[PDB]
């Protein structure tokens, strides 16, 4: 009973674009708390939406396991931005600056990973509209 309704296909694709917008808003806009928390909630919902889609393609395509090992570059994007921010703050508060560095890099991978999925979304949208 796969709820693969076109209304879902539309959302999954539309989530890939919004997920990138999240990172841009986080980088550009100097959000503080209340408005910053709302941003991360939106991102969390988006990552879950994309969380499902990925697990789905995983199960079918030659069954789970095998698939994931080929699409690891897609994992970093599936990490909620608010989760990394939360972690970085906790790490800095403990003076674990060496780790803050690595967490920094993980954030870079998250951005690249979402950018990758961003391009796929656009390319796919172009196909549904003007097939080729």
């Amino acid at each position: 009973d796969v709820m693969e309704h076109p209304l879902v296909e539309l959302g999954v694709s539309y989530a890939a674009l919004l997920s990138v917008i999240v990172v841009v808003v986080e980088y550009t806009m100097q959000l503080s708390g209340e408005y910053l928390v709302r941003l991360y909630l939106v991102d969390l919902i988006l990552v879950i939406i994309l969380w499902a889609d990925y697990a789905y393609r995983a199960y079918k395509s030659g069954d789970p396991a095998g698939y994931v090992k080929k699409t690891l570059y897609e994992i970093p994007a599936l990490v909620p931005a608010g989760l990394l921010a939360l972690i970085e703050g906790h790490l800095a508060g403990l003076g674990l600056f060496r780790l803050v560095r690595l967490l920094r890099f993980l954030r870079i991978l998250l951005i690249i990973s979402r950018g990758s999925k961003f391009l796929s979304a656009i390319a796919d949208a172009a196909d549904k509209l003007v097939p080729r």
Partner: antibody
Amino acid sequence: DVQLQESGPGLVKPSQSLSLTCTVTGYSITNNYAWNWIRQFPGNKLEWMGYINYSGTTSYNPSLKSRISITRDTSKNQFFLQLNSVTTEDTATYFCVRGYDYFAMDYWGQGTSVTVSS
Amino acid sequence: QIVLTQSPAIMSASLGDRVTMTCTASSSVSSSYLHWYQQKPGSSPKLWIYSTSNLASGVPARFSGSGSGTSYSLTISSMEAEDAATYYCHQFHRSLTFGSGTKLEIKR
């Protein structure tokens, strides 16, 4: 070669505000770590006052919370200390210091003497 | 927020003597956050030993740090004239606090 240098008036009147500047060279205060203000009293007791880290968040000594403020100017790679309503007991040598991993203070400024007197 | 009591407050040792000083905490301190500093009159303190037992770059092998929980120590296998100074321990738990210091003098 990381280097910190403190600057500002060495004399302040009671009730007024004490302001010091730390200019850092050889490393960017926005890159990583904590940037502290630590003072040492005439009897040589050391006391951590607070810091502002690479991301701009501040942390203060609870006994100074209501009187202090640490800010920064990233374009000049400097951070500042402001201690309000100072009294005779705030007379001490003030150090700007870098807080490395686990808050080990690896680089200290040479320190500046501040006297609070009328 | 813990209090670090250093002992002895003041001590003197003959050049060549083994030297041991202690840092006692009011509550348990994580070994990764216990650091020692050496300071001589007229200059700023220098990181000497970090995370309980790691000697700072320029620090001679005669020095060593040990301990855990609420009890740490700094030892000098053999006292040299340049070791005369005041040593401070430091810790972080909820806040940053410094020990009362141990002033090491030369015995003659």
